[PDB]
Design a protein around this ligand. Structure first.
Ligand SMILES: NC(=O)c1ccc[n+]([C@@H]2O[C@H](COP(=O)([O-])OP(=O)(O)OC[C@H]3O[C@@H](n4cnc5c(N)ncnc54)[C@H](OP(=O)(O)O)[C@@H]3O)[C@@H](O)[C@H]2O)c1
Ligand SMILES: Nc1nc(=O)c2nc(CNc3ccc(C(=O)N[C@@H](CCC(=O)O)C(=O)O)cc3)cnc2[nH]1
Ligand SMILES: [Mn+2]
Ligand SMILES: [Mn+2]
Ligand SMILES: [Mn+2]
Length: 159
């Protein structure tokens, strides 16, 4: 099973200048809980944005060019990325925009954080047809001293 996990600001913005400009510790904790002990697939730009391997996960990087770091697994196509995960229950696709586009048609589940923040951005999460997806979990949180925007965690499953 393939799942996508992402955090979206207003208008589905996910990034600006190869970065995420907000800081929401509660959402990073949610990301860690939902990805630990699973393979994670990311594109090369997202790998450069994170800047190090994510511990406790098999890190798989998509790039058309040879890898430059043997602490992670480098693959050259979507099918190779999936194969490199092996026989696991759930593969997590962690972006960025181009990678989410390619994996969305193959995904059964979306883990989305909706952040109440207006961000100039240059990267968006794909338009997804709402009729295709059922919301199975949602949890709203007001802003607090650690998290400067309100946010909603949602899990959607393909109908
Ligand atoms: N808010 C969030 O949840 C979230 C999550 C992830 C990322 N982001 C943000 O998203 C942005 C990065 O997204 P992006 O769309 O620019 O880049 P991306 O999807 O991370 O990376 C694209 C790169 O991945 C490689 N790639 C993708 N598909 C491939 C394929 N089928 N075969 C081979 N290589 C493939 C290519 O690398 P080569 O050029 O080396 O071939 C391509 O240039 C950053 O701003 C980041 O902070 C946000
Ligand atoms: N829900 C969600 N939120 C995000 O911010 C997010 N970000 C990415 C891409 N960027 C990043 C950037 C940093 C870390 C990261 O350092 N994660 C640590 C958390 C511990 C910490 O630094 O606070 C991890 O071990 O997972 C992960 C993804 C992909 N999916 C996401 N999904
Ligand atoms: Mn092929
Ligand atoms: Mn198999
Ligand atoms: Mn806000």
């Amino acid at each position: 099973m393939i799942s996508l996990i992402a955090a979206l600001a207003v208008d589905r913005v996910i990034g600006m200048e190869n970065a995420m400009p907000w800081n929401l510790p509660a959402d990073l904790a949610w990301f860690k809980r939902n990805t630990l002990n699973k393979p994670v697939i990311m594109g090369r730009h997202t790998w450069e944005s994170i800047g190090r391997p994510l511990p406790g996960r098999k890190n798989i990087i998509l790039s058309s060019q040879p890898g430059t770091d043997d602490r992670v697994t480098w693959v050259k196509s979507v099918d190779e990325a999936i194969a490199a995960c092996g026989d696991v229950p759930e593969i997590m696709v962690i972006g960025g925009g181009r990678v989410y586009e390619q994996f969305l048609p193959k995904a059964q589940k979306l883990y989305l954080t909706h952040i109440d923040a207006e961000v100039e951005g240059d990267t968006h999460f794909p338009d997804y047809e709402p009729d295709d997806w059922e919301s199975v979990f949602s949890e709203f949180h007001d802003a607090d001293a650690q998290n400067s925007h309100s946010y909603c965690f949602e899990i959607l499953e393909r109908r």
